[PDB]
Ligand binder design. Structure first.
Ligand SMILES: CCc1cc(C(=O)O)c2c(C(CC)CC)nn(-c3ccc(F)cc3)c2n1
Lengths: 253, 11
């Protein structure tokens, strides 16, 4: 019963998932392609309700995306059996260290080799246009594309991803955790049903599970590096104000 | 409460 409840919590709480992303990325109001600054402003005229630099505008749209995903992950976590029973400070700790690992995992679902869906599926910005931006904004998304290409080569579906994200959140070695024994047992259950699910769902890949353990470690490193870019921007970029929720997450991480 | 706490305390 654990696997089904987690998959349903994922379907209930994330506005965007892999099935919906592929349905959009294939056609069937097709996405407006943002490949240069002229198509950027055109998309912003049609979609967004600024005079700031375009890099700062893409920056503020990305963080609003992250704030909304953090809200979705919080509701998702509360639906993980056993999560709500933890001390409130333990739930905060799990979310604080878990959300960006989950975010970059789930971001892979909207990414291909050419770019990524944006604006709740209404736009598609190209990998090259993000590289064409001025430093340091050009260096933010490329490591996430690199991770996503290798992650997407595993060909997970939403049922696999939902259990994987639950395992990320329910991680007993986060700094400052009080009830480490209870959380470790929660994780052991999630990982157990994840392993059974990978065997049933991917019988062709008997090594899928250790592959995914490595992805959890790569994600931790991807987020550690990302947090360093956040601090660079908080210190050295004029108009790049950071959302208070996100600064609280990155603070002391 | 923190902002994370506020999200977690919502019904
Ligand atoms: C869509 C995924 C994403 C997430 C974040 C995040 O940490 O919540 C982020 C940031 C942070 C600072 C490094 C805070 C906003 N910056 N960018 C970013 C900015 C400009 C670009 F052109 C491309 C990506 C970002 N993207």
């Amino acid at each position: 019963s654990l696997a089904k409840r987690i998959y349903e919590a994922y379907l209930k709480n994330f506005n965007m998932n892999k099935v919906k992303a592929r349905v959009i990325l294939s056609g069937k109001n097709p996405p407006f392609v943002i490949h240069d600054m002229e198509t950027l402003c055109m998309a912003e005229k049609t979609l967004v309700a600024q005079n700031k630099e375009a890099e700062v505008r893409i920056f503020h749209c990305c963080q609003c995306t992250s704030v909304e995903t953090v809200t979705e992950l919080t509701e998702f976590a509360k639906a993980i059996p056993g999560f709500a029973n933890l001390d409130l400070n333990d739930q905060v700790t799990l979310l604080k260290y878990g959300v960006y690992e989950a975010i970059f995992a789930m971001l892979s679902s909207v990414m291909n080799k050419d770019g990524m869906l944006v604006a709740y599926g209404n736009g598609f910005i190209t990998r090259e246009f993000l590289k064409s931006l001025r430093k340091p904004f050009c260096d933010i998304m490329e490591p996430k594309f690199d991770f996503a290409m290798k992650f997407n080569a595993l060909e997970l579906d939403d049922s696999d991803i939902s259990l994987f994200v639950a395992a990320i959140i329910c991680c007993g070695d986060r700094p400052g955790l009080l009830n480490v024994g209870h959380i470790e047992k929660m994780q052991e259950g999630i990982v157990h049903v994840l392993r059974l699910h990978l065997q049933s769902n991917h019988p062709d890949d008997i090594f899928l599970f250790p592959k995914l353990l490595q992805k959890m470690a790569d994600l931790r490193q991807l987020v550690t590096e990302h947090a360093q870019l956040v601090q660079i921007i908080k210190k050295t970029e004029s108009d790049a104000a950071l959302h208070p929720l996100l600064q609280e997450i990155y603070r002391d991480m | 409460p923190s902002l994370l706490k506020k999200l977690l305390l919502a019904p």
